[PDB]
Amino acid sequence: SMQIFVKTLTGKTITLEVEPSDTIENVKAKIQDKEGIPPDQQRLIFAGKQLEDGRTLSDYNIQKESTLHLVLRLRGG
């Protein structure tokens, strides 16, 4: 329905075709389809906020040409 951008681990930008009703799980599955990163290892940041699983893009007001940022978790203790 609308196209969004995702900056990946190497800074390279990919595109995604999404719905405003799509969930963060769906977006993470599409990002895995393009990048090979399991959705449980993906963190998506939009406008400074981390996108929480179970929410939708409409909950975050993600529009066309919105840019997500894809990072991983570096766990320490």
């Binding site: 681990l9 190497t10 570096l74 766990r75 203790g77």
Partner: protein, 285 residues
Amino acid sequence: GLNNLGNTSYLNSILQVLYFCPGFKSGVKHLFNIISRKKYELICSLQSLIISVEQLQASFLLNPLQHDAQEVLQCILGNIQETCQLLKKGFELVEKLFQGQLVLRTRCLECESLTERREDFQDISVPVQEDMKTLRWAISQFASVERIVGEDKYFCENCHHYTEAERSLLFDKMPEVITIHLKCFAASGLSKINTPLLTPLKLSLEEWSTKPTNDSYGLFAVVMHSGITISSGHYTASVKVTYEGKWLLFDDSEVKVTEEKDFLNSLSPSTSPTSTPYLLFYKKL
């Protein structure tokens, strides 16, 4: 007895970085006073912690699961921000310290029309390797003109077609503290990149700003991760005192005072450090 600080080294590193951010604990004291005569638990525990660390630091000067650190910083800052908005309905602590605004431009290569998006940011996620490098290289990879082609073609509403496009990011409004989130992890499956960038002490983002600025930045805090994998490790934090001019090295329970020269040399990728920098913090000069 402090053989349990290491279990929360992510939270400890983030708290040590926030305690030395300029104006952070002043704002937390202000919000604590507001919430006190309002009668929130995050603000009150933050105040208790800041008072405890003040006690310990005054004693020092006179009488000598595993979690991601950036994610913990994000959670704490979001909670403080929500508390501020609720008390609002002084209350712009996170907005003035850590929040800037980006202008994201897309240029279609067919019709050459420009579309802009304005987004907020609290940190800058830059890559560390390509797929000896400096931080300038990483911020260029983040914000310089990138051409999206092939399978990542842009859909142009003006052409009503898929086109190649040029994207570029520009810094508009600037926070006082710039947080560099280093993507020191790669995917083939997931691994950690142990080679750090050549980190500078001084930073200028005028090369990627919407307007010519003379405001420079200075490195005051670094969060590092030790380990050969991304799923496990240990977080340390090096903060600069602004002892003023020395770097404090926080490793669990023991603190080391350091010259800026020795710290900068330890950061060098030519020395192959075991502590991989993960978060860089730059304050406006």
